[PDB]
Design a protein around this ligand. Sequence first.
Ligand SMILES: *[C@@H]1O[C@H](CO)[C@@H](O[C@@H]2O[C@H](CO)[C@@H](O)[C@H](O)[C@H]2NC(C)=O)[C@H](O)[C@H]1NC(C)=O
Length: 358
Amino acid sequence: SANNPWTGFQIFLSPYYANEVAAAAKQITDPTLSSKAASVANIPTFTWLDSVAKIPDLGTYLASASALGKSTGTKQLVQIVIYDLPDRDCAAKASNGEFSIANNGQANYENYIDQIVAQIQQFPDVRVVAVIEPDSLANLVTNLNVQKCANAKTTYLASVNYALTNLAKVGVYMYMDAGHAGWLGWPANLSPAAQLFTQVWQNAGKSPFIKGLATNVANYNALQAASPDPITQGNPNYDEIHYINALAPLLQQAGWDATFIVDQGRSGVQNIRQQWGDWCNIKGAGFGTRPTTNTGSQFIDSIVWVKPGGESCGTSNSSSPRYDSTCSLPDAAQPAPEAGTWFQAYFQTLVSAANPPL
Ligand SMILES: *[C@@H]1O[C@H](CO)[C@@H](O[C@@H]2O[C@H](CO)[C@@H](O)[C@H](O)[C@H]2NC(C)=O)[C@H](O)[C@H]1NC(C)=O
């Protein structure tokens, strides 16, 4: 559209990912591979606010971005993921979300949003782009027979509403998570998906700050595949461009000229999955297309790196309180540490298998 949130801005680079990557590169013994790894700290990623404990970090990033913009004569942009719904990840075998619907989950989540708004309010010279709640609304399309998801439906809808409505008041550009081509891109899922996302957009007042949708977050799909991944059989929308090309007109018909961002951070290697639903620490993944607004699609504002490659998706240790058995599948890299903690061997392969090369 006319207003691409990224145009004319310099993206603030995550210091947390930068620190993880710096510590990782010096453990990589091959000196040319190590230097390639270190340059990954120069590639913009999204910062995940997956708990209230991450909110002070947001404050420091906004303040640092503000000072960097003044130091360099630029306008800075901070990239965040809103990821703390009560009863988070309702269809998963395990979730790490700190809030529960049974224990004031909605009110606690609204306080989490309020604390994020109170930080953003203080730095109006910094632009913020937020991905809204991966692995949430997409469950309300296809997973309503999971009892945890059926029970969470009204809370997901109310809490996402609260996030959209209140982040809009401080001017945050927002992309609702919308799964990926293998989830909502199935032709039969397109209309129910469009209906849900449009209703959410309406409930939040159709704010122009609700730009559209984020796809392939933390996943591995191609944006544009040379040949369909065997896991996609039965779905004519076998990559993200097919999915977005099919969904975007349905949103436009409802009055919402929605645009998209697409995670490609771990999309460099295709055809590495046994089944499309396999999502955890998929073995052999490589860093993919670097973030850019040169997307080739009228519908896509940016290719992005939302999931930071090298942070684990989940432990493969079946004795952990947080164990998700998806993370022990044959196509899952093992042994894997706890979700969010650094997974050095996985990072090294992301670097070695990067396509385009680093
Ligand atoms: C796999 O998970 C279990 C439990 O989460 C870990 O075993 C516990 O580890 C803690 C800290 O080392 C100890 O206090 C407990 O006594 C252990 N309980 C049992 C039954 O062993 C286990 O260490 C984890 N394995 C790995 C590689 O992380």
